Amino acid sequence: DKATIPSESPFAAAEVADGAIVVDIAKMKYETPELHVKVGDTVTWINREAMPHNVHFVAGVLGEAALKGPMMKKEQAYSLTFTEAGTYDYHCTPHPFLRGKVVVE
Ligand SMILES: [Cl-]
Ligand SMILES: [Cu+2]
Ligand SMILES: [Zn+2]
């Protein structure tokens, strides 16, 4: 696969370090819709609102299987580490028009 999962379940956003690579979700937007990172970088999504959100990479994107992330409640977070250069689109399962992209060089 082209990424690994530090934590299979969501965790408390307060645990994320300042200066960690963070994508906020709010007002039905990934606050950084095209994120540029390097191989080995760990990306953390944080849900800032009461509507639950996830990140969903369809089959083909990070491997032959889809990576459907767990639903994050308000102030919950979820990380992925990108291990291979490429460009990876994702969306939120229940809200397919909430979408983003990670560019890994
Ligand atoms: Cl499916
Ligand atoms: Cu959503
Ligand atoms: Zn809904």
UniProtKB/Swiss-Prot annotation:
Subcellular location: Periplasm
GO molecular function per UniProt: copper ion binding; electron transfer activity
Metal-binding is among the record's keywords: yes
Cofactors required: Cu cation
Cofactor binding comment, as recorded: Binds 1 copper ion per subunit.
Domain of life: Bacteria
Entry keyword Metal-binding: yes
The entry's keywords: Copper, Electron transport, Metal-binding, Periplasm, Signal, Transport
Pathway: One-carbon metabolism; methylamine degradation
Coiled-coil residue windows: none
Boundaries of every Plastocyanin-like domain copy: 1-105
Any GO CC annotation of this UniProt entry: periplasmic space
Residues that hold Cu cation according to the record: 53, 92, 95, 98
Stated role: Primary acceptor of electrons from methylamine dehydrogenase. Passes those electrons on either a soluble cytochrome c or to pseudoazurin.
Name of the protein in question: Amicyanin
Organism: Paracoccus denitrificans
Organism lineage string: Bacteria, Pseudomonadati, Pseudomonadota, Alphaproteobacteria, Rhodobacterales
First and last residues shown, out of full length: 27 to 131 of 131
